[PDB]
Amino acid sequence: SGAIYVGNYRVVNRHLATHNDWANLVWEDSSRDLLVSSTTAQGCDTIARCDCQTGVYYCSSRRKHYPVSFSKPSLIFVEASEYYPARYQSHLMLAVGHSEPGDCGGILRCQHGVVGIVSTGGNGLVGFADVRDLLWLDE
């Protein structure tokens, strides 16, 4: 679990969105596994606006933050899970690192701010849903 809180927005994995998220919906995209809802209080996270390929992510199944090198956002085939059939997920970046299903939502960040959140994993890989192209999150 986990979310990004920027301005009056809450960014979560679409597959983990709550009923309150759907009832206060701003935008959602199943192909990216992202959903954004509106919040009453203002958030403290800042979104990175860069092309960094190194950063640090939070792994809840280890209570640890790990530094990683990650690929550029791309269209990647993701195997069938209990939340989605086997499909191509877009705007996804891969890194070598530990992940388990409940790790989705953990933040990946670089020197400029938040880059994205954990969305996929398995076999010593972790995939992050990028949010750096969503310029409207800052307005």
Ligand X SMILES: COc1ccccc1[C@H](N)C(=O)N1CCC[C@H](C(N)=O)C1
Task: Out of 25, 50, 75, 125, point to the residue binding Zn ion (CB under 5 A).
Answer: 50
Radius of gyration of the chain measured on its C-alpha atoms: 14
Q: Which residues would be at the binding site for ligand X (CB under 6 A)?
A: 15, 33, 78, 81, 83-84, 89, 99-101, 103-104, 118-122
Q: Is 112 annotated as a binding residue?
A: yes
Task: Out of 11, 12, 16, 48, point to the residue binding Zn ion (CB under 5 A).
Answer: 48
Q: Which C-beta is closer to ligand X: that of 37 or that of 120?
A: 120
Site for Zn ion (CB under 5 A): how many residues? 5
